[PDB]
Amino acid sequence: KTLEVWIMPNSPQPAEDFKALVAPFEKAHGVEVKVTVLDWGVAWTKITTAATSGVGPDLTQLGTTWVGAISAMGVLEPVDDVLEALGGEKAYLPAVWRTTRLEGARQATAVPWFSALRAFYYRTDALKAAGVNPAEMFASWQGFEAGLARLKASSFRDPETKAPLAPLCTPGKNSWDVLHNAAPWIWGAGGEIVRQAGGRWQSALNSPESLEGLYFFLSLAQKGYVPAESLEKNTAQIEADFQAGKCAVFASGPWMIQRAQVPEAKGGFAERTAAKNLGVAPYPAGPKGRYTFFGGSNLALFNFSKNKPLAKELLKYLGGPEAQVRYAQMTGMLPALRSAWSDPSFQQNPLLRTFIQAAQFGRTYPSLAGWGGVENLAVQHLGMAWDLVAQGRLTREALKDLMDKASAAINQALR
Ligand SMILES: O=S([O-])[O-]
Ligand SMILES: [Cl-]
Numbered sequence: 001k002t003l004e005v006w007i008m009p010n011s012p013q014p015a016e017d018f019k020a021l022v023a024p025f026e027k028a029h030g031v032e033v034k035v036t037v038l039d040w041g042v043a044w045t046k047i048t049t050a051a052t053s054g055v056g057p058d059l060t061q062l063g064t065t066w067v068g069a070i071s072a073m074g075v076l077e078p079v080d081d082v083l084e085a086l087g088g089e090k091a092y093l094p095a096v097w098r099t100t101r102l103e104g105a106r107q108a109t110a111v112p113w114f115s116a117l118r119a120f121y122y123r124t125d126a127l128k129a130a131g132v133n134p135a136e137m138f139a140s141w142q143g144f145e146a147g148l149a150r151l152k153a154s155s156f157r158d159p160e161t162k163a164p165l166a167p168l169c170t171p172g173k174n175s176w177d178v179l180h181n182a183a184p185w186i187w188g189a190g191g192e193i194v195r196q197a198g199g200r201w202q203s204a205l206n207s208p209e210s211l212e213g214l215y216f217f218l219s220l221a222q223k224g225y226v227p228a229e230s231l232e233k234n235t236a237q238i239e240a241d242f243q244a245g246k247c248a249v250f251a252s253g254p255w256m257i258q259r260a261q262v263p264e265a266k267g268g269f270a271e272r273t274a275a276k277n278l279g280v281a282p283y284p285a286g287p288k289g290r291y292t293f294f295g296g297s298n299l300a301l302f303n304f305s306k307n308k309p310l311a312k313e314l315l316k317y318l319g320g321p322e323a324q325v326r327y328a329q330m331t332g333m334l335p336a337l338r339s340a341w342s343d344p345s346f347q348q349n350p351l352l353r354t355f356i357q358a359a360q361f362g363r364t365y366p367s368l369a370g371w372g373g374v375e376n377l378a379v380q381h382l383g384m385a386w387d388l389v390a391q392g393r394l395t396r397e398a399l400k401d402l403m404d405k406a407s408a409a410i411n412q413a414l415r
Helices: 014-029 040-053 064-072 080-085 094-100 124-130 141-153 178-188 208-222 235-243 255-259 308-319 321-331 338-342 350-359 371-390 396-414
Strands: 002-007 032-037 059-063 111-117 119-123 166-168 194-197 200-203 247-252 278-281 292-301
Touching (some): 002 014, 002 040, 002 308, 014 308, 014 321, 040 064, 064 094, 064 371, 080 308, 094 111, 094 292, 111 350, 119 350, 124 141, 124 247, 141 208, 178 208, 178 292, 178 371, 200 396, 208 371, 255 278, 255 350, 292 308, 308 321, 321 338, 371 396
Parallel strands (some): 002 059, 166 247
Antiparallel strands (some): 119 247, 119 278
16 A cells, blocks of 8 residues: 655755655555655756646655646645644644635645745854944844944955855856745835735735835945955855855855754865854845745645545655654754744754744745746846846846836736
């Protein structure tokens, strides 16, 4: 008696980690869980083919931003029942709960599995040497920029590189997460990517507030705070640069905390100066709010499964306390289930405690069926803004004309 699950590579040994996660469930139910690991390069197309053909697994992982699109194809089983048995809506952050359904939909089609959230890592030694107080650097945007000006002026050299640290490392346009990097700034200025008006969704990227947050973020790169080399690279490469002592400050997820403990030999950075001088702070309070970008993944049940009762039991298991703590450990993510945040594995680690403070500002995109195309069209136009930054040519006026073009393309795709 077997269940099939599709996952993406969430942990260092994806298949082995997941088989170890579900071993107590297999024992309690006398069943085998078969897991297939889908590379992020192919997971979407594969899940899409499963949806159209009626051929696929019992359960699939979905990126949180995938929920709307797959739910709208009519192929996912309602899991309102699973979510109630896990404690219902108030068992989750509002931003995580929004990812359980197509936006506006009556029934839940996905169970929260784990959360990817971004906070700022910083070199405690570099801020010390630049005379930057971390509380002030991360309390306002003015403080954030004043902090980067002291880090730019600083004579601090990394003990290993014997070279200056870049004040801020961030990707520009050559990364999968272009929109995610900008989102906190758009939100913090009081804006948003999409808005409801006359009862339908429209681009809000050209709103006054959205443009202010975007220009604030992008102009940091234009003022000398971000290396030109950062703008050509992806998030993984920027991670590597921070580990190798080239960056004072950069946004990433909780997984860096585990990597700081792992030898270079085994793909961690324990021996690097950065590992022993690691601070974390949430994104700084904006003038019109304070927001932490949430992503990560949920689990869903194809309505063609012949094993819905056992699959729902496995959804309750994976979504529930013990597996929530266990898989967060394996993946270096935060549990989707808020009760799992009190586990000693989190509470005994001050860096994880800071990620839990960052979690209270949690915000996600609305779960639109057409979210992919909105994000893709946004990212096309943000990329052109990053090109202007790279030349020192981004003005507020030039940013507005690109986001007006973005907004016309987005509105047509939504209309
Ligand atoms: O360092 S103590 O806060 O875990
Ligand atoms: Cl939004």
